[PDB]
Design a protein around this ligand. Structure first.
Ligand SMILES: [Fe+3]
Ligand SMILES: [Fe+3]
Length: 179
């Protein structure tokens, strides 16, 4: 065989960040807020710039639209936990550093067709994990704990992240269709 799994081109897969599981729903909300704001603030704007600089403005507009919706998810949870003090974990700080190293190479990243391909594939990876695993698990726990309002919020976030996965897949299919 190859003898190893190659890491993705330019480390773009490490843009994906997952919320951390806890026993307590306030802490799951805090972790979600953290990650969703990182995607709103940092991840998706960077993907949008890769798209634009690759000559793909429509896909860039999609990433800008998704970014705003990640902020909506965070703001719903903030409304429910008004007093929470959310801080970036080590892993979010590392991801923000990575974002800044791609920004300072943005021209090279975009000029290679893998830049945008891997950005879309990383978006798909997070939207998949969020929609199918992480936020269903948070919704289930919140319900178990009798926290109906927060369970309902996570169920709405699940719906939205599922939509994003669909958007991203359709965009990937078109990106890769030349004609
Ligand atoms: Fe998200
Ligand atoms: Fe999303």
């Amino acid at each position: 065989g190859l003898n190893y799994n190659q890491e993705d081109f330019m480390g773009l897969d490490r843009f994906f960040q997952d919320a951390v599981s806890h026993n307590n729903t306030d802490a799951n909300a805090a972790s979600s807020i953290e990650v969703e704001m990182y995607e709103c603030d940092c991840m998706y704007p960077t993907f949008a710039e890769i798209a634009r600089r690759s000559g793909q403005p429509e896909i860039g507009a999609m990433f800008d639209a998704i970014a705003k919706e990640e902020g909506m998810h965070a703001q719903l949870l903030t409304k429910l936990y008004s007093e929470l003090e959310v801080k970036d974990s080590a892993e979010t700080l590392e991801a923000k550093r990575l974002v800044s190293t791609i920004e300072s190479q943005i021209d090279a990243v975009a000029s290679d067709s893998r830049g945008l391909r891997r950005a879309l594939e990383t978006a798909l990876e997070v939207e998949t994990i969020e929609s199918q695993k992480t936020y269903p698990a948070f919704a289930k726990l919140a319900a178990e704990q009798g926290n109906m309002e927060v369970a309902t919020a996570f169920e709405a976030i699940v719906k939205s992240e599922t939509k994003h996965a669909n958007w991203v897949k359709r965009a990937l299919e078109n990106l890769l269709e030349v004609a």
